[PDB]
Amino acid sequence: SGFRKMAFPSGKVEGCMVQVTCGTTTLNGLWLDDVVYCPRHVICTSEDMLNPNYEDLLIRKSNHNFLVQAGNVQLRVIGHSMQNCVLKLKVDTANPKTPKYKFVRIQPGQTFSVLACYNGSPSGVYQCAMRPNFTIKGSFLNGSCGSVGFNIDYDCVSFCYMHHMELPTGVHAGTDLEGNFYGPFVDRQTAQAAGTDTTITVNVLAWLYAAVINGDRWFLNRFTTTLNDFNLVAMKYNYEPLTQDHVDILGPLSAQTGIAVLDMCASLKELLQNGMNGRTILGSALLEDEFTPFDVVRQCSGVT
């Protein structure tokens, strides 16, 4: 019983974090097989950050201008390529701790665990969602760049996120592990705007299911509704509209609790149009959208 924001155990990622140093810029990198992946802005000085020419900047650097360190081990860089916004350094040594891993680009509304690091050392682990506007509400200080987001599927580590920067608004932007930004952001110290953020409706519904399961049923009502009718109310409140795929994904939670998705949608509507009124759900006074239906099931079934 009980319900928490749970992160994946970080063990397998801890063994891939390294410190990367070019000139006087240091940040984190990710050491898999005989390659170190890190944000390409490692090769910028402070002057350069307003309007960097990454091609002209990279042409000045050699293999020996890069210092990769794993704990007290120095690694020797023997190749270097730029792939979009990441830098690949080819090292002499394959990482004995390299896990079963994939690189995955994720979709907005998906959750993952971040291992936040400084100088290639772990400081803490937390779970978060990729916002619909392609930012994350993270916790990152200077030097956290190259911290990664990851999911685990049994013994397989799926890398989905590398942290590149904080926006002037205080939220976080980064790339997949092929160096493509999530969202419309560039790795440039200039003013950039995220879109309007929305609430991830499917995840709110999954959290309501988690609540019922764990005893918390006050908000259940007699009413029901249409998908169309429900989406009209969701839009006025900046909620993501609900598709049939979203209904299909909640089927298991529906079956386990014996509550129709649309009956749960009717319960949600009523909370949008009346708020919580000084009540709580799983000890939150707000609607929580950082658990997917997958997360609720893993946590409420005991998946290792």
Ligand X SMILES: *CCC(=O)N(c1cc(C(C)(C)C)[nH]n1)[C@@H](C(=O)Nc1c(C)cccc1CC)c1cccnc1
Could you give the angle at the alpha carbon of 110 between the alpha carbons of 105 and 115, nearest 5°? 75
User: Which of residues 116 and 265 has its CB atom nearest to ligand X in the complex?
Assistant: 116
State how far the alpha carbon of 116 is from the alpha carbons of 70, 146, 231, in Å.
16, 9, 37
DSSP-derived pairing of the beta strands 66-70 and 86-91:
unpaired
To ligand X, the closest distance from the beta carbon of 206 in angstroms equals: 29
Are 200 and 240 a contacting pair, CB within 8 Å? yes
Q: Which residues bind ligand X (CB under 6 A)?
A: 27, 41, 44, 49, 140-145, 164-166, 168, 187, 189
Q: Which of 128, 145, 160, 265 is catalytic?
A: 145
Q: What is the DSSP string of 245-302?
A: HHHHHTHHHHHHHT--HHHHHHHHHHHHHH--SS--BTTBSS---S--HHHHHHHTTT
User: Which of residues 12 and 164 has its CB atom nearest to ligand X in the complex?
Assistant: 164
Q: Is 41 noted as a catalytic residue in this protein? A: yes
Residue 53 structure tokens: 């020419």
Q: Is 143 noted as a catalytic residue in this protein? A: yes
Phi, psi (rounded to 5 degrees) for 252: -55, -45
- Dist CA 179 CA 53 (whole Å): 16
Q: Which of 16, 22, 29, 41 is catalytic?
A: 41
Are 30 and 36 a contacting pair, CB within 8 Å? yes
Q: For the chain, how many helices (H) and strands (E)?
A: 8, 13
Residue 67 structure tokens: 């210092």
User: Which of residues 134 and 219 has its CB atom nearest to ligand X in the complex?
Assistant: 134
To ligand X, the closest distance from the beta carbon of 181 in angstroms equals: 11
To ligand X, the closest distance from the beta carbon of 182 in angstroms equals: 14
User: Which of residues 27 and 114 has its CB atom nearest to ligand X in the complex?
Assistant: 27
User: Which of residues 50 and 260 has its CB atom nearest to ligand X in the complex?
Assistant: 50
- Dist CA 242 CA 145 (whole Å): 35
To ligand X, the closest distance from the beta carbon of 262 in angstroms equals: 42
To ligand X, the closest distance from the beta carbon of 27 in angstroms equals: 5
Question: Any idea which residues carry the catalytic annotation?
Answer: 41, 143, 145
